[PDB]
Ligand binder design. Structure first.
Ligand SMILES: *[C@H]1O[C@H](CO)[C@H](O)[C@H](O[C@@H]2O[C@H](CO)[C@H](O)[C@H](O)[C@H]2O)[C@H]1NC(C)=O
Ligand SMILES: *[C@H]1O[C@H](CO)[C@H](O)[C@H](O[C@@H]2O[C@H](CO)[C@H](O)[C@H](O)[C@H]2O)[C@H]1NC(C)=O
Ligand SMILES: [Zn+2]
Lengths: 8, 440
């Protein structure tokens, strides 16, 4: 994968 | 057509290479590899797939494990299988194809070409498949069709598309949260992508992609973007946010969906090291503005916070430790120019960078910070030296940034002087007011 997130 | 049952028999048109579409927009891999959805479900066992005349074209079968879950007792983010969409990819040949399916899967045709207009339509007949169907607003489907598809589904996954969006979500969640409102959901998704295409200038410059963006369920993490598109956790909490068509256009659900798609659409020339969680939120703010949502920069008092950290702190933009502070100047440019007679500001800046920006990776990506400054000035014929100076764009030094990858930028005095002299040489007027003082 090459995952860009958000950590809420 | 007419070669067999609906979905089991269909004729597939070649789509443009998703990788090439991304490369031309400077966005990299993110369009749907699964766009040629079949509406066919293949149970475990031996299958027969008939393929018509290929004229030697490359065509393959994708069988993604969309229902892949962490093993018992495995914490979903600690999954050894990772967060990616696992699939079997089987090359297809003209005539009879014998395919062993180990894990039941929805079928997707992979038919991509470099001359999309001049590739044959290829019949594919899943003579041993089950018709799950799919929902397609562009075909004329209504909520009556949506309800029937969910009620008649043979797969845990329902496929759906609109003009821009492809969706692969569990029937369970679609029934629970979308209920009868399939048209409203797909239209909401299309609206949110279209807002980004408009801000990118794709409508203005005739570059709206044919390729769709896939929103998939996953069983590992809340919300993310990867090379396959955007992914949303298959739990009640997250599916309530994104599969209810009212919820996905409100507040944090609208922000999260827009942010994830914004990662697909953020261009390399606006996404140098340290910008990965910055440049996509221009799309999030524009989506909020177009959906009746309040500005997150306004709600967080980010204008004052950013001016305190960067301008009053007299630090480099590259030294900012807050992705919302780094977003503030990007959004000030939009709010200032769109209300002072340049309504196509970002559409034109992004087209300018597509046509004019360099090709940089790793530590060289800092050159894009200066190409971005030049684009903003040239598009608006405005001398923005003072604005970019105040926001710390022109501070020379060696800057270390952690942004997924590690970056070591070397901004030399020569690099800063070359950019400032390029701007000065244009002889453009300076803004009458201090754009850094703009707040909502
Ligand atoms: C990514 O999407 C998330 C969707 O829930 C979320 O909006 C996140 O931003 C976070 O928002 C939280 C409030 O909903 C907190 O304010 C948190 O501090 C913040 O990071 C999105 N991330 C970004 C960077 O936009
Ligand atoms: C989402 O989770 C990601 C890990 O899977 C990652 O922690 C990401 O946070 C980003 O991490 C970078 C460091 O490599 C930068 O510090 C970036 O600014 C930071 O946001 C998570 N997203 C967010 C918005 O925190
Ligand atoms: Zn993000």
């Amino acid at each position: 994968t090459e995952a860009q997130t958000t950590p809420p | 057509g007419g070669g067999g049952p609906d979905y089991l028999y269909a004729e597939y048109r070649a789509l443009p290479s998703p990788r090439q579409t991304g490369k031309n927009l400077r966005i990299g891999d993110g369009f749907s590899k699964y766009d040629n959805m079949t509406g066919v479900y293949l149970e475990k066992g031996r299958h027969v797939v008939l393929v018509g005349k290929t004229e030697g074209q490359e065509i393959s079968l994708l069988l993604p494990n969309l229902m892949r879950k962490p093993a018992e007792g495995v914490q979903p983010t600690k999954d050894p299988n990772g967060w990616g969409l696992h699939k079997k990819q089987i090359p297809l040949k003209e005539g009879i194809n014998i395919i062993d399916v180990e894990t039941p899967a929805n079928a997707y045709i992979s038919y991509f070409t470099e001359d999309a207009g001049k590739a044959p339509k290829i019949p594919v007949h899943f003579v041993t498949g089950k018709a799950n169907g799919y929902f397609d607003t562009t075909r004329g489907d209504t909520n009556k069709d949506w309800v029937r598809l969910l009620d008649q589904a043979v797969s845990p996954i329902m496929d759906a598309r609109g003009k821009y969006i492809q969706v692969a979500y569990p029937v369970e969640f679609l029934k629970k949260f979308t209920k009868d409102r399939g048209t409203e959901l797909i239209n909401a998704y299309d609206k949110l992508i279209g807002i980004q295409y408009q801000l990118m200038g794709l409508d203005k410059y005739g570059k709206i992609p044919e390729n769709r963006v896939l929103a998939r369920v996953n069983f590992n993490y809340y919300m993310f973007r990867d090379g396959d598109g955007v992914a949303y956790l298959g739990n009640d909490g997250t599916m309530r946010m994104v599969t209810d068509p009212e919820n996905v256009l409100k507040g944090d659900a609208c922000w999260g969906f827009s942010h994830a798609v914004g990662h697909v659409m953020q261009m390399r020339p606006m996404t140098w090291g340290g910008m990965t969680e910055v440049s996509n939120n221009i799309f999030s703010l524009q989506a909020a503005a177009k959906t009746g949502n309040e500005s997150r920069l306004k709600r967080q008092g980010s204008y004052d916070k950013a001016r305190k950290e960067i301008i009053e702190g007299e630090i480099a933009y590259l030294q900012s430790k807050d992705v919302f502070n780094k977003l503030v100047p990007l959004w000030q440019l939009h709010l200032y120019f769109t209300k002072n007679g340049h309504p196509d500001f970002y559409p034109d800046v992004m087209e300018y960078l597509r046509n004019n920006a360099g090709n940089y990776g790793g530590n060289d990506t800092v050159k894009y910070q200066f190409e971005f400054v030049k684009a903003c000035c040239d598009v608006t014929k405005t001398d923005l030296t003072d604005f970019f100076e105040k926001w710390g764009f022109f501070k020379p030094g060696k800057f270390h940034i952690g942004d997924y990858a590690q970056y070591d930028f070397n901004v030399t005095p020569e690099m800063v002087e070359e950019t400032k002299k390029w701007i000065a040489g244009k002889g453009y007027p300076k803004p009458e007011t201090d754009i850094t003082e703009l707040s909502e």
